[PDB]
Amino acid sequence: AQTVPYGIPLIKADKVQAQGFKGANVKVAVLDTGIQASHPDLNVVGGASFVAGEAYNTDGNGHGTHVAGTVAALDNTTGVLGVAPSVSLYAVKVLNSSGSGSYSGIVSGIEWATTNGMDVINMSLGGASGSTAMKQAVDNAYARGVVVVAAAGNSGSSGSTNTIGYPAKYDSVIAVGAVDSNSNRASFSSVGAELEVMAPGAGVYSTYPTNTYATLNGTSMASPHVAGAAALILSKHPNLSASQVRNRLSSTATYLGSSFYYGKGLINVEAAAQ
Ligand SMILES: [Ca+2]
Ligand SMILES: [Ca+2]
Ligand SMILES: [Xe]
């Protein structure tokens, strides 16, 4: 009755979970199109909406619900299994129903996370251009001890052309690319000097409104794998700093080729959480 998406063992999240670490008491904010809080395979602890006319506990798009399920779908006898199933999940709506949102709403969501004491921030979103305030917000959250993770982008490769987007391009943010179940780079995965690590982003099965499950493709799918892994690293070593968690993830990654295309490589949660 419960399905295990290929990405959980690929990054070896099942081995840390096996040890008894499943993200308990770690707070993760999913900044996205919201979350269908009523989904039976999810438990949303709280949140905030910075999008006019939509509450935080509803998700008219699906993107937010899918991403959240990858970070924390509940470990039970139904649906799917998240990377960090016992995490404290918070839905921070910064993108509307059409999957777009303003920089100020995004910045407000980042600051909210920061202020409410989140441990991890997932941003499965990107822009061609960043901004002063946005860099300000991610720099302060990082300096404040928050692990900021974002989707690198899905514009692929174009010669030695840097295709990484904002906010993944900022050095205080972990830029995550996408691989498939074969551990090969997804053709849509953005490339460039700032690419830091890779996670499963192709053919990812997760929670989807209403009360169902679906398969999506995107660096948006990869990011939550790293946000979840960071949660597992913290559940095991509550002591680590944001920089140390980050270092653990890129330092222990499985090499797959050139940094321009793969960053340090595919993450390996077992190794990083040693
Ligand atoms: Ca489940
Ligand atoms: Ca970055
Ligand atoms: Xe994205």
Resolution stated for this PDB structure, in Å: 2.2
Bridge pairing between strands 147-151 and 120-123: parallel
Instruction: Report whether 64 contacts 208 (CB < 8 A).
Output: no
CA of 215 to the centre of ligand 1 (A): 16
Identify which ligand lies nearest to the alpha carbon of 176.
Answer: 2
- Clarify whether 32 is annotated catalytic: yes
Residue 157 identity: S
CA of 208 to the centre of ligand 1 (A): 13
d(CA 215, CA 62) in angstroms, rounded, equals: 11
How distant is the alpha carbon of residue 79 from its chain centre? 20
SS3 153: coil
Pure H helices in the chain: 7-10, 13-18, 63-72, 103-115, 132-143, 219-236, 242-251, 259-262, 269-272
Binding residues for Ca(2+): 2, 41, 74, 76, 78, 80, 168, 170, 173
CB neighbours of 62 closer than 8 A, spacing ≥ 6? 33, 208, 209, 214
89 to each of 51, 70, 142, 232, 259, how far by Cα in Å?
Answer: 19, 12, 19, 14, 32
Pure H helices in 94-193: 103-115, 132-143
169 to each of 3, 54, 97, 135, 177, how far by Cα in Å?
Answer: 34, 29, 25, 10, 12
Superfamily of domain covering 1-274: Peptidase S8/S53 domain (3.40.50.200)
Of 86, 189, 190, 220, the catalytic one is 220
d(CA 153, CA 255) in angstroms, rounded, equals: 20
Q: Residue 175's closest CA among 158, 161, 192, 159?
A: 192
Q: List residues, by chain if needed, whose CB lies under 5 Å from ion ligand 2.
A: 173, 175, 194
Question: Which sign, positive or negative, has the C-alpha torsion 171, 174, 177, 183?
Answer: positive
Instruction: Report whether 32 contacts 63 (CB < 8 A).
Output: yes
d(CA 61, CA 79) in angstroms, rounded, equals: 19
- Clarify whether 237 is annotated catalytic: no
Question: What are the extents of the domains in the chain?
Answer: 1-274
Instruction: Report whether 58 contacts 37 (CB < 8 A).
Output: yes
Q: What is the CA radius of gyration of the chain?
A: 16
